[PDB]
């Protein structure tokens, strides 16, 4: 399968579903008490759902935990989606196992051409509305900054990256907001935006997590 595929149950154990009566966004578990997501996913009364596969069915590996806190990045701009990152505290610590695991923070930024894993539940159709119910996966390289910016002129900042193919076809536009981009076992990206939807020269656009690591560590330790 060249593109969107079915991950397999609990193959991506750091993957979280944010629920407000429905699944509205994804997120990543970074330690037993904290989740990172996109700031554009900011909402009151979240329930964070861990160990999911089929989000409509109780399949036995779940943990359902209310969010106690959310902290949107102080420089988040909801017009440009610059600094599209938010931290979510769990009311109770999650219980960690094979299917519920934390993802490490990067120690450096990943380079262009690095193959990454993008995951989520969101829309599959470049042209229509089709929302599947088990965890979906995509493997794509990080594009060069040039390639990214020339696809979205004036719209890409240092705190963003693109991943995929300049011919489009395979993309995570609405492909599940808030969800992870993981490269070499490290969390590099957060599913942020993408003008169009898998259009020719319209990749996915991700929050460049490697710029925020000091913010994340300082903030979680203080909160
Ligand atoms: Ca389930």
UniProtKB/Swiss-Prot annotation:
Keywords: Calcium, Digestion, Disulfide bond, Hydrolase, Metal-binding, Protease, Secreted, Serine protease, Signal, Zymogen. Binds 1 Ca(2+) ion per subunit. It is an enzyme of class 3 (hydrolase). Residues 1-221 form the Peptidase S1 domain. SMART domains: Tryp_SPc (SM00020). Its cofactor is Ca(2+). Coiled coil: none annotated. Pfam families: Trypsin. The active site is at 40 (charge relay system), 84 (charge relay system), 177 (charge relay system). GO terms for cellular component: extracellular space; serine protease inhibitor complex. Subsequent cleavage after Lys-125 leads to alpha-trypsin. Further cleavage after Lys-170 yields pseudotrypsin. A cleavage may also occur after Arg-99. Not sulfated on tyrosine residue(s). Belongs to the peptidase S1 family. PANTHER family: RIKEN CDNA 2210010C04 GENE, TRYPSIN-RELATED. This is Serine protease 1. It comes from Bos taurus. The lineage of its organism: Eukaryota, Metazoa, Chordata, Craniata, Vertebrata. The gene is PRSS1.
